[PDB]
Amino acid sequence: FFHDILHTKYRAATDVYALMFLADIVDIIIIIFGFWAFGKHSAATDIASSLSDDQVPQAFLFMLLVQFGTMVIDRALYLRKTVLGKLAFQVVLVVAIHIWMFFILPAVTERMFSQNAVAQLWYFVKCIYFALSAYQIRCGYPTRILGNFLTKKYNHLNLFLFQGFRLVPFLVELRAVMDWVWTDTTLSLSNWMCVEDIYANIFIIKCSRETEKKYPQPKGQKKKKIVKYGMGGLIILFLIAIIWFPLLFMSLIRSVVGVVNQPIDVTVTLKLGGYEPLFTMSAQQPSIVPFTPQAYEELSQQFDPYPLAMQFISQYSPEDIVTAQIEGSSGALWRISPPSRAQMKQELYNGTADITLRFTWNFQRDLAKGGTVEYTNEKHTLELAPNSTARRQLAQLLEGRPDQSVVIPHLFPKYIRAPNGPEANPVKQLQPDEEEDYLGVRIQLRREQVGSDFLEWWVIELQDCKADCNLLPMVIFSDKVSPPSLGFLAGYGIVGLYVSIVLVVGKFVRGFFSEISHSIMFEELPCVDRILKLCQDIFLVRETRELELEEELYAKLIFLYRSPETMIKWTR
Amino acid sequence: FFHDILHTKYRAATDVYALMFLADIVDIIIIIFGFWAFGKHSAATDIASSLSDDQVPQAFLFMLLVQFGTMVIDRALYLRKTVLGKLAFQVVLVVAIHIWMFFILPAVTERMFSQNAVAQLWYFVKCIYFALSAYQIRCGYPTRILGNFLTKKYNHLNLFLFQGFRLVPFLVELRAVMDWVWTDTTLSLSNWMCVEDIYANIFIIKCSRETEKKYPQPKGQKKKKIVKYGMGGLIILFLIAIIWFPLLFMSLIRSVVGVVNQPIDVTVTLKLGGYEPLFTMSAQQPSIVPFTPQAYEELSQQFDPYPLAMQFISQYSPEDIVTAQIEGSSGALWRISPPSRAQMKQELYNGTADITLRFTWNFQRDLAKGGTVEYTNEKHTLELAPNSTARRQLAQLLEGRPDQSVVIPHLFPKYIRAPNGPEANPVKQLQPDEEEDYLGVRIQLRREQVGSDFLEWWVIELQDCKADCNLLPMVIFSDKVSPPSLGFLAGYGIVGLYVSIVLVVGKFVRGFFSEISHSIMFEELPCVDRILKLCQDIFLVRETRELELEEELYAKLIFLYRSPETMIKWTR
Amino acid sequence: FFHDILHTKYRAATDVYALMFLADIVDIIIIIFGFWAFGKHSAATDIASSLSDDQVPQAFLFMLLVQFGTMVIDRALYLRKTVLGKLAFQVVLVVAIHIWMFFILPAVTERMFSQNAVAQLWYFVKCIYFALSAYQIRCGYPTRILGNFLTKKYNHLNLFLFQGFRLVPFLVELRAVMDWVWTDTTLSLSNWMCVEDIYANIFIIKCSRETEKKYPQPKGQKKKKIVKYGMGGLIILFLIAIIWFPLLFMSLIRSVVGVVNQPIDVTVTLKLGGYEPLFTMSAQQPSIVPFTPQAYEELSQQFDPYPLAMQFISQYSPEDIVTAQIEGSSGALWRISPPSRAQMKQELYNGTADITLRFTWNFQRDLAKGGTVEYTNEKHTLELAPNSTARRQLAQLLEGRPDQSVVIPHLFPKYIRAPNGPEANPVKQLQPDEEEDYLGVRIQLRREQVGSDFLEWWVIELQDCKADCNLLPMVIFSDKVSPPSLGFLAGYGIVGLYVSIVLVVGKFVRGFFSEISHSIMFEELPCVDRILKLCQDIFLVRETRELELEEELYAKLIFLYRSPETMIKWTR
């Protein structure tokens, strides 16, 4: 609607712009005592804008319409422009430093912010930091705008007035800000800069010396020591050492994990030779029963006389142990073909080789909770000798007399470990005689009608079952799992610590002591400038003073910044 | 054949060698307008060989017979023999350094090349770099060979003639080459070297100062500034800053790796209590039908009135969604035991406890395309109350009247998510009343003659099925997968950035400004040598000039290299 | 018992303590010499204690009772105390620094040791290092204890007596120990310290110069060079370069990890359309038969005329290849429903669309041995055209005439690869005409009463089977697996090498040459102190000598340490 209204009338769209332009030109020109105010206003506007975007970034939160993000970008276009105006207003010749350094300190930020959000989000918290850095420059900038009025030399002097409080601010910015900033000063006079860069460093230290002299003289006392002042520096140092030492301690365990694993599914089979399996069963909820403290106490009472068993058991909490209450009636009909059933009967009776009887278990775990290996499994096998009693009795079951059964000794390992890895062995500490400690199993063949041929399925039970012969309770001890191992290979972990200690050493080693630089610097502050000058001549700095002489060619305004040094030199 | 021919005649194999040796001995004794040429020729030969190997390495490509690699190694043996071989000319006394010179700059390379190829290959591209480094030394070396003729001091002087162009070459080699090279000079006089090493650094800077003086004087102008020269340095600096800033921005590139996941297999079951499952079905191609844009539009129309549903749906492209057209006739015969069948009928009719009816789903995905979790699954359960209508009606189905059925309300969750993890929940945004929004299922028993009992299987259908009652369409929304997460733990990612910013800071911090060193250096170049000498005496360098005095003991030829400094000193 | 005895009598517990205390106060002051001996004894005790803990840590080995670890900690409490009293009552009244630097050099260690053990163990080997560092300080400390007697200045002087042997010891400690130690000296006079720190560095070099002068004068010869001395430095340098080239090259050190993979389980199915599968079989041990060298030779003879086949085969050792001897009688009864059976017969005969016949294979591997992908699989499908001979013949089998069969050409791919990834394709190099090279399969339906309808199962055999028609031998070539890939993404691996070369470069670059510092330092050693003093005045060091003047205010004992410098200055 509003867009349409602008479209509807030609006059509103145009002429107006021209008028505005005229105002900007003439106004900026006619506005005798002002433009300076306008520059301040423009700086204020920028700060406000930044806040809005900075405020906007923090404020919206969460995730915002994809289109909305585009609109903000469109909005950013606006910010870039406007500035375009005053850009060459202050601006470049009068103080290009404006649109200049300031101009750079935004384009980089804009690219990062779009990049930072990605699809993941959380960019803004990283992003928000960026806005603040821009803002700090702007606050300096707003005064900055009347640069010819502002006088670059004057701003530094005021901090000198600030002294120790002023000195702290200079320290806070640090080298990195200075290096970026030094370059802009370098950019105006790059060739000197390389020469210039050394001077700026020198100046900084000289400024530091003056600050010490200032508040120091009032502060200074002769043959006077204060315990409290010493303690704060020393207590902090001890804390810093602790953090360096503590941090290594802090991370040494920064890694860790531990959550209970219970197989979701416990699948067991009984299979004779290569014949279709006799029995299959898969237990799931609620047939997989976690140990209560009562179950744990009963298990502990059972194994109390045996320290090795108790040492094993004590590694597990009740929650780490389940009883899989395995139903003994096969879950599926026996699917054997008639010729193979006949072959099996014949092999059992008449075979001259062993026949293998295999009991398998396979425990499934939920990887969503942790761990890396979904299934852990193993098997127990028995070789049934030719003509053996159990073998003939098993064969006899096929004749279909319902009251008959066979006992297979040492078939069922009751206690099994389900570790993090894929091999789940019966627990030797609880079954130290191995297979001799496995339980006997009574096997029967069930047959229903039918009609002669009938459905068939196999039923197993523990030989010594009492209260619940339909169940074969398998006790499973599951080691806990963790999402991340952390260190992984030992060598890599060791190297990182060495890098931490080595890298650390290198950084610690690097600062060193600048005895040569210090001696020249130290004398001058205590030293008189003339004495320093006599001192000064041997070092290059006296030569630099000579370069001061070149100053004479240099333009006076640029000379003045150089001149400030002479005042500094006079102060020296 | 050729090998046999050499074997066949004794004379060709021998005497010849002796003659060759004699010739070699004499060639040294020729001795003038020859041996020097021979040294140059030998250097040429070496360069040629390298290229051949360098040419050979790049040229062969791909993977080459294992035996062929061995032959090349055998060939390398030949090269080594020739080198050290002729090494008795330069050599061990005269062109000592030159002699072994490349001696070191080859053995290290040979070990790496064999190591680099491994079984993976691609070693040569890494490998090829190595040959070039050897070659560069050789080009210097070939002139090098007449070392007594060559005069080490003279070669440095010519670069001085080169000046600014010459200066660039010196800069290009860098510190690392110099440190390795400095040592060889150090090796001849190691004790001085430690003293010597400082001098070489000093010399370099002195050489740099001369170069600046040279082309600089013609170049130099008074009170003259060129915008173009400044711009190139500054534009590059901005680009460098951007790369530093851009590179951090660029890294985000990593974050990315999306591809569609559709379960290959959709397996569902319906199971009453612990009884053999009534119904099982596994849908695979082409029963798993990806959404077309038409299907997506129809789904969008269905859920249009509901913003939360539409917000869910909009997260998926048609390719991310499938309809599993589940066949409602069980894929397997019911395998129950008649006794268990009798128990089930009795429990349904007469049981005083609830009985659970469970509908399960399990979606299999192809890990070869991406992702980490192959199966994602869940279940819906209903507790059928004792004496409830549905329970009695289900029991009635066992009597085998083919026209009968039972409806179980709220059994089939039509809309399910198949996320990256192992838990696949029905979509609440599309089914906000949860189980009340699941679909009713009509169940029938298909018992068939036989002959008593009749082969049995269960058939399910959606209660409100219209056009395709044989199908139960389950709509599955699969989140995309990516091969690599990248950052993994948040702390590690943050640390790397800090290291990048911290490490970066450290490197940036390290260069610093050498004000003390610069001041001494700066004065001398502008400064006259005598004035510098007066300046010179206080620093150790004047003392070094005094060491020059030791030169007198030192051998004159070794003295001359020292002497060059005096000429340099005179130049100073 | 013993604890009870102390409890039983009041007198033993008390009065005694008081007496001891009295003695200690009495012990400290009384005999001319005795306390100094006591300080030495206390230092000895500490060393002994350290050894015991150090001895104890190494000695116990393995893992020790959790309670036992607690007891040791309780023991450590004891160690801390004893000094508790001596902490300031021993007492380092004068050399307070005693309970100082020494006190610090233990608390950090104690925290680390507890942290180091964790639950993993192996902490002690890392832990043991810590004890030794404490011990070294203690040995210095024991003499240290009579600090007023000891004279800090005197200890440094003795090393001067040691000279070159003495010098080596100073070098060994390195910067890191000094920086920590410098601070303690700094702590007494921190403000000077910053000034002081430069002096200590200066002193070190001055000490080094004296050592060179000492043994050097006897050692020194004029115009004399020894080959052997040069060789050791140079040979070591070459070795160091090799280590950097060979040591740094020690990167590939992590490039290998594999053995043999044979599928534990080979599962195959034959399925017509969506009907219940006709045939399923899972082969496991010992039906999965690894190739012998005889089998490998026979396979090589079979494929000898074909270079591409032989190139494929040569990539595998016999151990990498198995024959899965697949039983051709289905492992399960056919579970189809009559109509599912009637529908199938009708579709085979009367259908107007194609019907799909699918042969699948799925190979299971043991991840515990290595690898990442447990199952690898694929399938071969044939579209049986309407009214085709094979389709009608298959339908005919359902009528139950036992002598009948159908041949399906090109159904069984004999040679299949089981690679590291999830897709297991038939080997094209051994079957270049693809499906035309797959083997024909003869299918039969087995069915027996009962006694119309009697159990059914399907039997397949290779069309051209001769000796073992019950088996369908599938030859499977499995690529080896390794536990760790290592490099992973190419860019990351390249960056590390660059960091290794770049990082390395940076460290190599960093040392540089200190020409300015060296020149001042070099002149003084050769230079006379007076001449040096004339030399000395221009540098800050002469100013430092002036600070020496402040010494006058400073306390004489603290002055003496400063005074030692003057003696050093006199030596200069």
Swiss-Prot record, chains A, B, C:
The chain crosses the membrane at residues 17-36, 57-73, 88-108, 117-132, 233-253, 486-506. Residues 37-56, 109-116, 254-485 are extracellular. Its main location: endoplasmic reticulum. It is found in: Endoplasmic reticulum membrane; Endoplasmic reticulum-Golgi intermediate compartment membrane; Cell membrane; Cell projection, Lamellipodium membrane. Expressed in bladder, colon, kidney and skin. Also expressed in bone marrow, liver, lung, spleen and erythrocytes (at protein level). Expressed in myoblasts (at protein level). Expressed in red blood cells. Expressed in cochlear inner and outer hair cells (IHCs and OHCs) and vestibular organ HCs. Disulfide bonds join C465-C469. It comes from the Eukaryota. Pore-forming subunit of the mechanosensitive non-specific cation Piezo channel required for rapidly adapting mechanically activated (MA) currents and has a key role in sensing touch and tactile pain. Piezo channels are homotrimeric three-blade propeller-shaped structures that utilize a cap-motion and plug-and-latch mechanism to gate their ion-conducting pathways. Generates currents characterized by a linear current-voltage relationship that are sensitive to ruthenium red and gadolinium. Conductance to monovalent alkali ions is highest for K(+), intermediate for Na(+) and lowest for Li(+). This is Piezo-type mechanosensitive ion channel component 1. It comes from Mus musculus (Mouse). The gene is Piezo1.
